[PDB]
From a paper:
Cross reacting material (CRM197) is widely used as a carrier protein in conjugate vaccines. CRM197 protein is a nontoxic variant of diphtheria toxin (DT, molecular weight: ~58 kDa) with a single mutation (Glycine to Glutamate substitution at position 52) that eliminates its toxicity. CRM197 is synthesized as a single chain holoprotein, which comprises two domains fragment A (catalytic domain) and fragment B (transmembrane domain), bound together by a disulfide bridge. The B domain contains a subdomain for binding to the HB-EGF cell receptor and another subdomain for translocation into eukaryotic cells.
To verify if the rCRM197 produced from insoluble inclusion body protein have the overall similar 3D structure of the protein, we determined the X-ray crystal structure of rCRM197. The asymmetric unit contains four molecules of rCRM197 (chains A, B, C and D). The four chains interact as dimers (chains A–B and chains C–D) by domain swapping, with each monomer in ‘open’ conformation, a typical packing that has already been described for both DT and CRM197. The overall fold of the monomer rCRM197 is equivalent to C7-CRM197, with an overall RMSD of 0.34 Å for 451 out of 498 superimposed Cα atoms. The dimers in the crystal structure of rCRM197 and C7-CRM197, are equivalent. Furthermore, previous studies showed that the substitution G52E induces the dislocation of the active-site loop CL2 in C7-CRM197 with respect to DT. In our crystal structure of rCRM197, we have also observed a low electron density in the active loop CL2, consistent with the previous results. The structure revealed that the disulfide bond is conserved in rCRM197. In conclusion, rCRM197 conserves the overall folding, making it structurally equivalent to C7-CRM197, which is used in many licenced conjugate vaccine such as meningitis, pneumococcal conjugate vaccine etc..
Numbering used by the authors:
A (entry chain A): 2 to 38, 51 to 187, 199 to 517, 520 to 535
B (entry chain B): 3 to 37, 49 to 187, 200 to 535
The structure:
Amino acid sequence: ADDVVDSSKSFVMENFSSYHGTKPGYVDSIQKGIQKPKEFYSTDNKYDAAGYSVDNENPLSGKAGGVVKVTYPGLTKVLALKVDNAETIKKELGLSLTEPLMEQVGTEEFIKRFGDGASRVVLSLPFAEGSSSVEYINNWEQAKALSVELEINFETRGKRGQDAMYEYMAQACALSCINLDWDVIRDKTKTKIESLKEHGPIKNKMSESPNKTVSEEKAKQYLEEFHQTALEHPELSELKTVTGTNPVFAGANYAAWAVNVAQVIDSETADNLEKTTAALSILPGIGSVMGIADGAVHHNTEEIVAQSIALSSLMVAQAIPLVGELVDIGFAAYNFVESIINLFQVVHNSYNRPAYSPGHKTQPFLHDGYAVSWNTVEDSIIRTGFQGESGHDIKITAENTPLPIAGVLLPTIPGKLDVNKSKTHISVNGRKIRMRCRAIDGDVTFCRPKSPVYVGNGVHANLHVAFHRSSSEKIHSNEISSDSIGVLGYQKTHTKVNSKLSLFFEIKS
Amino acid sequence: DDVVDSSKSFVMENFSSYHGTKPGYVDSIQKGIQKDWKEFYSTDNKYDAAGYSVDNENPLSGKAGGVVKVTYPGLTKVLALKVDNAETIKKELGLSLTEPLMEQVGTEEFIKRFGDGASRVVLSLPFAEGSSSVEYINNWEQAKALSVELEINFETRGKRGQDAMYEYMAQACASCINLDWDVIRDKTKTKIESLKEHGPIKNKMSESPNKTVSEEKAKQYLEEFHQTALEHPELSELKTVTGTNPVFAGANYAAWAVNVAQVIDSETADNLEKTTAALSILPGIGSVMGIADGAVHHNTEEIVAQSIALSSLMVAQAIPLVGELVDIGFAAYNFVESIINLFQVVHNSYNRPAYSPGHKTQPFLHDGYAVSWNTVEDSIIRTGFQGESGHDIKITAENTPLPIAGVLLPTIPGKLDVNKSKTHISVNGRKIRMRCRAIDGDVTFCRPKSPVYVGNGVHANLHVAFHRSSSEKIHSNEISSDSIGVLGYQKTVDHTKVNSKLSLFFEIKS
């Protein structure tokens, strides 16, 4: 009982409501009543619900139906479960091992012992890893008592692609919130493509093209030339400025991408938005077109996005005869734009959703071939407000060849926070190695291993950092300058700089 | 009162353990063990104890003492602890909060209450993550009863550097890398010698700037020297084994050599400890060691000697071009001694049991992606019962958005089917359902119904769910692959489509 039901998350409430994403065509009909076509699903977050509203026949690019709100009259008990294993659930709550779960949850017998005087019971679960959303499981028979309201119908807006669905989800965050007007982007994209077809210098570059199936390498050099020529045009002004220094946004990457697109798109694929999206979605290098690198979305204005898509479009049109099997170049301006637009929206949605950055909690920090992470969530928390010790474990390894760990930088506080020298150590494939710790200043201590440490494929390390607290005083924000522990990798030189591997921590009671 | 692990606690007659001893104390400590965690440490593994035997003043390159075995007469209680926080240990067991733990552990009140009849109690802790060894903590007063015996004295053997210590630690696995470093040392000199006093090699050794020159130009010349040097008969084996793998290219030997010449000054070259400390923080050493893709390729005395020799000569050439060392004896002196120590450290790590990438919670790093089983239990597929199981996989990537095309899953009719309704993937919390369809009778491929991209700031949790219709246990000879294949981006090699494969290895258990 207490081993599968989370009482703290269980509760009673009058007019319990939740949301249900609905496919195209069922938005008006479901309003007449919740009917079985083993459970009826709903969620507490109307935005997560919108993500289930896409046409099941065209899941990647199809149209989105809508979201409806379902409300149970009277009192409803929400029963939170710690596990989603039915047989396990049954063996604990002393239920009929033979009879289905959601079958018993709808019977009065179950409602009395678990409902707390409520008219019915609805099961609850964590919506997903990395989500604070809740997923509800409703009995079909009890669900028949739900009154249904229209929360929103995406089709009636009359927008293109899945624009309505994504503009809706973007409301959750309205760093920063990416809330782009894709109508304007679609409009600006078309306008720019057009301007870039009938021009002086750009039209000249098109006539200086092989226009025949050629090797990748030759296809790429011409494309880079095209990219450079094209980028000097006034309408790609801003793009030229924002793509000039970050290697990831270089012409060579726009060409690699364009070549790749031409290679995998044939006539049948070009003629279908769903199949095009499928093909493009598994390609590498898309971050170059989206201007997404180093954990941030750099292309976040309608103007710059339309310029990048227009430039990639034009380029794909060029890479087609040189690399593709396709004969109809129309694909570059039609489905390629439609498909890539969708992909942009997916990635933007992802950056808009709360998530831990590398080195925070158990999200690994990947850098220079190394992978480091806090072993457990509690490890990333430095508790305060007490005298005594604590231990914090950090996992460390590398992708291939032996890369060294020179040591670690740890925060200190003259008076309170101190590094416990004897308990701080690092182990390599189980070999325990002690460390030599010395203050580099009042607030930072550097610990170096007393034996050489290397990690790589097949060789991992556990860095165990231990802290000593002299007083029960709480660590205030100002006291600790940095917010991360710095593991140091290899040294590279005319100045010495170490590979910085960061693990971010939180200060709590 | 859950700070003691009774399952691992026991009483034993003549409880013995091992203690690593520093140089000069091997003989003396045998006369007897003498003085919050003031303790006398010992361990159940004499090889791990050998690792604490290195001179405190020169811990990187210094000499090793030896290992001694300590035995308590009569019966002894080994109390296994679940935590190393003394304060917690005091509060839970209901002891005084003001007096030091190890002081209290050696008293009769404690010895009667927890000793289960023993004459004294010894505390026990897990040695460390990735280790199955045990660390013992002894009360100094009680430790006076320990009889001390010699297991091995490393200096008595009279070997060079830390050879005796590493030869001894290598007995544990004696695939085991068990190299004879005397032979390797002797062959290194012989090879360095032949390579300096030769015809063809000295011809290239003459066409040198021999003056502080550009770093790029230093490399170029070194790559040619490497190219030329590698044609000598004494480096024939190395020529062949370093021929195709890019990690072992002359360019890497050059990058390595240049890096060495840049960080060694006369003071450093004159002190092995300082040389090791300087060299131990440089990248690219796997080029010289021949270590890549999870294996030690240079595992014969001959080939190891050639690589070090070749590296020594290159460092000798790199110095004038980039370094400021008026002397060049370093390349043949402390450079060889220090790099030898580093080969030994890395070899020892590959000799120790450890989980490979994609096993247990060790991540699998490849093509910018990083994937791992969420917990150790997730990597275990239980069999021998009708029912469902869930398995969570963490997925992310280093920088730009890379896609996840799907996942290849093993299937066994009745004993292991994919539960299509509960199999899904979440990206920064957005739950995405999957379309699962068999490729063949043994493998099922699940594609996400919404495009999936991971990268810096975007992670995914792939939740694989299995259904078992039969109670019959899955037998070993019934699954072809022991891994779950997560698929990343697709690439067209020439005109052939291949997927970036990310593997999570699982174990079948009852």
